[PDB]
Amino acid sequence: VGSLNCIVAVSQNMGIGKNGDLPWPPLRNERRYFERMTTTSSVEGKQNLVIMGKKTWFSIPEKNRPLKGRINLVLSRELKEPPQGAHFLSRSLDDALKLTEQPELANKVDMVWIVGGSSVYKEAMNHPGHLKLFVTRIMQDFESDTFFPEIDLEKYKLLPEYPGVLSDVQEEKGIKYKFEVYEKND
């Protein structure tokens, strides 16, 4: 099992969800970025594991579930069984990581990508070790009811002009955004 990563899109007001869905309208090129980052494995022959809460799962259009070319895992304590389309359910990130050390997954998984929401990001950020955050900064305020944790700049480093990520400001649907990458290692 390779690196642990978070990927998130966050508004100026730290918003990441409203009613369990994106606070902003769909951003097609941003979503394509998401697909590329989460799908590309760093080890030939292996797939990445995408971990998400139940609301994130439901927010994905059903025609695109499970996310193709990635192993999908849902984190929930409320769900009794993996939701329709998913084959893995865990109670917590540590439980999910334990699962990747098991036969079914042990030699299938490369990167782990946490893809939302709030509490699973918090879990990942509280986990010791090397962690990269791929953050899309949505450059406007949007009404939100869930939020991304603050990034501890005493611990994380911003990585300017990160390779393979566009450094210039992007725009879709009149909404500007930019890609930033941070990392910690402890």
Ligand SMILES: CN(Cc1cnc2nc(N)nc(N)c2n1)c1ccc(C(=O)N[C@@H](CCC(=O)O)C(=O)O)cc1
């Ligand atoms: C609402 N939601 C969660 C979502 C959306 N954008 C994000 N963007 C970033 N940067 N990070 C996230 N965690 C993120 N999460 C969605 C919605 C749709 C798809 C989706 O259909 N993705 C497909 C299709 C991608 C595409 O058509 O471009 C894929 O293959 O990843 C993913 C996540």
